[PDB]
């Protein structure tokens, strides 16, 4: 194990820990691709957690500065303020692949707003949040996941990320509330006559299930649309991206079976992950 090798192993560790599902799927990529994924993910995770876990804006700005250092001087040695193991690895990927740095900055901008949390008025704002937090990631990943870095490849990758995020939100309703966040739009909550506080207290009624299912359908519709254009990605990434999505779609069904609980985090078992991988490989 070289030094860089250890830097990537640490990134791999962060991904296994925080996103078992993405880990399960993207670890099947060729070595050079999965390492890139590990690093890009770890950066994104670090950005997220600096607000969501530490609520530490100063930390957040260290990371942006690190990435900025990288973008500017890809080939100079940086005393990263941030987490030097991750930034060393990102810097390494940057040397070999084209990194959409503005997409990282869009992420940082969006995660920043979570620190002074205000609710969205409309769905279009929630959708813009999904771009900012997940669509951006799809953009950063795009050069890794396909050989055609065109606007149409990007469009599918964006929608992939945003649908993943919407599903993340639909799993996290309870725990986001306990964190005093609601990501359902005010528009849609009123229209459906849902109050998350109230629903948190006395359980899940018919008006909540309708609203949740309204967003689910959108995520499921969007995933379908991505799955059609799966060809945009490389041969090797196609079945992986299909798996990663199938798993995350299965998260919706798990919420459903647990009757939409706002009081635990549902998950897909490794055992069902394996199942899905089988279901998928017959066709590849
Ligand atoms: O930033 C997230 C993310 C991670 C990965 C993808 C993805 C995007 C496109 C394709 C595959 C995966 C999207 C979002 C979302 N949010 C929680 C998870 C990490 C950290 C902040
Ligand atoms: Mg977040
Ligand atoms: Mg978070
Ligand atoms: Mg979440």
Swiss-Prot record:
Positions bound to (2E,6E)-farnesyl diphosphate 1: 18-21, 41, 45, 171, 248
Record-level Gene Ontology MF annotations: geranylgeranyl diphosphate synthase activity; metal ion binding; squalene synthase [NAD(P)H] activity
Biological or metabolic pathway of the protein: Carotenoid biosynthesis; staphyloxanthin biosynthesis; staphyloxanthin from farnesyl diphosphate: step 1/5
Cofactor dependence: Mg(2+)
Entry similarity comment: Belongs to the phytoene/squalene synthase family. CrtM subfamily.
InterPro entries with a match to the protein in the record: Isoprenoid_synthase_dom_sf, Squ/phyt_synthse, Squalene/phytoene_synthase_CS, Trans_IPPS_bact-type, Trans_IPPS_HH
Residues binding Mg(2+) 2, per UniProt: 168, 172
Entry keyword Transferase: yes
Reported function: Involved in the biosynthesis of the yellow-orange carotenoid staphyloxanthin, which plays a role in the virulence via its protective function against oxidative stress. Catalyzes the head-to-head condensation of two molecules of farnesyl diphosphate (FPP) into the colorless C(30) carotenoid 4,4'-diapophytoene (dehydrosqualene).
Cofactor remark from the record: Binds 2 Mg(2+) ions per subunit. A third Mg(2+) ion binds between the 2 farnesyl diphosphate (FPP).
Reactions catalysed according to its record: 2 (2E,6E)-farnesyl diphosphate = 15-cis-4,4'-diapophytoene + 2 diphosphate
Enzyme Commission number: 2.5.1.96
Residues that coordinate or bind (2E,6E)-farnesyl diphosphate 2: 45, 165
Binding site for Mg(2+) 1: 48, 52
GO biological process: carotenoid biosynthetic process
Protein name: 4,4'-diapophytoene synthase
Entry keyword annotation includes Lyase: no
Keywords on record: Carotenoid biosynthesis, Magnesium, Metal-binding, Transferase, Virulence
């Amino acid at each position: 194990m070289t030094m860089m090798d250890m830097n990537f192993k640490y990134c791999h560790k962060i991904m296994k820990k925080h996103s078992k599902s993405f880990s399960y799927a993207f670890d099947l990529l060729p070595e050079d691709q999965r390492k890139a994924v590990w690093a890009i993910y770890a950066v994104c995770r670090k950005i997220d957690d600096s607000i969501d876990v530490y609520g530490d804006i100063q930390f957040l700005n260290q990371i942006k500065e690190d990435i900025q250092s990288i973008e500017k001087y890809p080939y100079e040695y940086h005393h990263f303020q941030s987490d030097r193991r991750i930034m060393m690895a990102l810097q390494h990927v940057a040397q070999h692949k084209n990194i959409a740095f503005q997409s990282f900055y869009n992420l940082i901008d969006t995660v920043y707003k979570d620190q002074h949390f205000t609710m969205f008025e409309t769905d279009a704002e929630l959708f813009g949040y999904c771009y900012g937090v997940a669509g951006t990631v799809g953009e950063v990943l795009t050069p890794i996941l396909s050989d055609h870095e065109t606007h149409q490849t990007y469009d599918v990758a964006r929608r992939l990320g945003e649908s993943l995020q919407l599903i993340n939100i639909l799993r996290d309703v309870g725990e986001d509330f306990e964190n005093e966040r609601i990501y359902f739009s005010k528009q849609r909550l009123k229209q459906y006559e849902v109050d998350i506080a109230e629903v948190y207290q006395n359980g899940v009624n018919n008006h909540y299930i309708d609203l949740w299912e309204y967003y689910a359908a959108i995520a499921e519709k969007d995933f379908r649309d991505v799955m059609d254009q799966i060809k945009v990605f490389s041969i090797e990434a196609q079945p992986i991206i299909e798996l990663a999505a199938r798993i995350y779609i299965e998260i919706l069904d798990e919420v459903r079976q647990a009757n939409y609980t706002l009081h635990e985090r549902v998950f897909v078992e490794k055992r069902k992950k394996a199942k899905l991988f089988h279901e998928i490989n017959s066709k590849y």
